[PDB]
Symmetry: C5
């Protein structure tokens, strides 16, 4: 501005879009969940509804630049449409995920992208024994839908889910939450697919 | 990398889109269902809700290339908008199907496309006797909406539906699931239309 | 394909889109309903939900061609966005209609288009007496929203609705179904508007 | 068609879009409601659902033409996207309005536009006493959201709402319906904003 | 209006879009809420639904002009798509916000923009004790999702929410409503993020 505008122009207008990773130049996405609320539980259909936001990080050479060339600009915000983004998907979802945040990411001079969408998800979960002291445990996998391990790998900075933002007066208390990496194989396809498995253990509030 | 982008450009930017099959150059789509959950049953309206993903395969000359000409590239992922896709449709649906996965397909050097959309479908089904030991049986046909047998044929690699991914703690147990090919005639039109008939037999979990 | 692609290109890329009918060059749409299910009935709000598919036919000179010029091609499928389509609308709908089928039509060398969208419609209907043996009767008009009789006419191949595809195990049995043409006048506008009136008579099982 | 296509092209392709009214060149929209059904009433949240269609008229110099120059064409239908339209909005709505009709308007040689969207609206209304003989009364204002009196004025051809199209077998009977013009002031802004206040009085039966 | 068209053309057609604020040229948005109705309360999931409209003001050099050059034009209305707008977001929302108004803003010769979207929001709130005389209190933060304090600051013209437009016959009476500015830090990010905290205290009508 004029610097930022020129920068954005150079990356997006002058180049073709990054065509996604491949076996030859694969990519690693760092996931991390901040759980906000277990909004509702349906014991007649065994689906439960979570609200959270999911931090995604990755890095691309396509998105690098030299700050001195662009008015000492270290980073910028941009629409998620302007860049490639990973197709992280909830495998046991029962309804399409609802986006609760804007679709804007941060890009930085070293090509690192950060993107943190807020979501509401309804996923498969049997709440039997939520009323008990012992509580009930449910799990849901997040991972690329189309990209194998050989193109997209996932990692977590910590197995502990971020519960510091959980709703004080929720109907359900969280006993524990876990974000652990996994490998899976499916009947369609020879290659392994990577996913981060979100496992929550919860119960009704006294 | 550059090597790909060039490929994608050659297939999509330089050519006009494949205009769909015709009697002269017809096409065969291979369908296959992985049932995930029978989410809910409504006995007051006789509609039942399934979550699954539906594997679609087909092949086009339009999409072929020579790997040596494109940096030894065997295959790639792309948006479903970038290519023609078949109009497989649930004939007894009561509500529009909801897409639970991204709209990305895999294309390969020999022109083979694979596309596996995850869906939630509400279809016509009378659950009377779901509580019994015997269970209740329901069926729904999938097939092209507009393309006759003479333009689109359907086939299955197996009559057995893939239940290996079914939800362990679902409200309903699957006794059996079947994907069998069928031929049908409709009053509008002289030609026969092909469909794969999904037949599931299920009951409450006891 | 080479042939078909060229054909499609000539009709759509090289010409401007058909700007809809007018008084001078009017047209006639043939409607026909295949009722599939009466899904639900709400007696607290007097709305009922139907699932069906609605066959639409019409013909345009804009869409004609000579098969010999295009590799003996008699007809083809295409997206509904690529062509003009008629604005048939349910006058007593209480919620926007939901499309249950793809938006693809068939065009033929003589300019005839066929298009059969599958729909779910919620329309105004008082089900009082649906539980009785006598059953209850409800009606809903379908017709162009903006085009008068003088631009769009409607006709039916038969007054009998196609119930051969109705759901065997539906909560409601169909006693009868009727698709009859009508003329209507509205206070806004001098001209008459045409509609096909769908009348169904049904009850619980 | 050739003629019509050329006309449409001249108005839309060759000109930039009408940039909306201003203080200097203000505009008057004529509103008129045809109420179809009071579909449902929720006494636990005090919202009620109406289905109707709302006639909008206005006139622009931008849209004028000479019929002799265009094959004696008096008028035509077109997409609502092709022209500017007014931002009439329900002030006491509790949910986004649902469009039940196509988005097509009629334009005429003297620059007059007519546009009649069918809608379902959920708005704020306490139904307490709907079961009584006396009935209950509710109101909802329609007016531009962003344009003051000084840019958009509203008028009504009649204070009587058009109930001739109301549903015979609705759960609720209409005792009366009124479309009266009003002026309002809001805390944000010095200028007055115009609205047409729809007031309905109704009950069960 | 020949004049207005030319003006609009000069700002939007001839220039590239304002690329959003940065640390170097930051921006201040003035928020203000007019609460219309507390429509419903769900005590089984602890979510409550508000209808309101939210006044947003800010100023940009990009949008300035000289009235003498454009037929003494002081201001104009335009689509929200034609200009940059701030990404104010409800942090404790449980469902995507629904827009109840048109997406039109007012721009003025000194570059000031005003934009007042009407919304329905479902947010996290425990209504326990709404039936009491004492009432129950709930809060929800509004702020940029992606822009730190260093790029977007928020302010309020008054801590008092505008209740003059509240629904006379609502199921719930408003005891008080507050729009107060706040600073927050999140685990992802070193910088502080600004939010205006909407705090309402209410009860059943009795
Ligand atoms: C870029 C993209 N998404 C973000 C999400 C958040 C934040 C910064 C972001 N930056 C913090 C503030 N906004 C909500 C969360 C936490
Ligand atoms: C290409 C395109 N679609 C796919 C869908 C799936 C898989 C691989 C795919 N590869 C497995 C993993 N993702 C969901 C399903 C099963
Ligand atoms: C052209 C356009 N739509 C059609 C819809 C159907 C059919 C033929 C069509 N042809 C029959 C077979 N497919 C579903 C319905 C009935
Ligand atoms: C142009 C635009 N909208 C219209 C809406 C209607 C009519 C004519 C129209 N002409 C009458 C017939 N169609 C529904 C209503 C009433
Ligand atoms: C520009 C943009 N949005 C506005 C919203 C409103 C108003 C003026 C506006 N001007 C007042 C009248 N319309 C609704 C609210 C209050």
């Amino acid at each position: 501005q004029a610097n930022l505008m020129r920068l954005k122009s150079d990356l997006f207008n002058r180049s073709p879009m990054y065509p996604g990773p491949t076996k030859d130049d694969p990519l690693t996405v760092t996931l991390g969940f901040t759980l906000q609320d277990i909004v509702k539980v349906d014991s007649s259909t065994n689906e439960v509804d979570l609200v959270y936001y999911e931090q995604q990080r990755w890095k691309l050479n396509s998105l690098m630049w030299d700050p001195n060339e662009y008015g000492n600009i270290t980073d910028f915000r941009t629409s998620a449409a302007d860049i490639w983004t990973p197709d992280i998907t909830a495998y046991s979802s029962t309804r399409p995920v609802q986006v609760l945040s804007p679709q804007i990411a941060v890009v930085t001079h070293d090509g690192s992208v950060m993107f943190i969408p807020a979501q509401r998800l309804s996923f498969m979960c049997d709440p039997t024994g939520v009323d008990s002291e012992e509580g009930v445990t449910c799990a849901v996998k997040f991972g690329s839908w189309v990209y194998s391990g050989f193109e997209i790998d996932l990692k977590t900075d910590t197995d502990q889910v971020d519960l510091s933002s959980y709703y004080a007066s929720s109907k359900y208390e969280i006993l524990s939450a876990t974000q652990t990496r996994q490998v899976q194989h499916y009947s369609c396809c020879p290659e392994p697919y990577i996913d981060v498995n979100l496992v929550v253990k919860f119960r009704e509030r006294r």
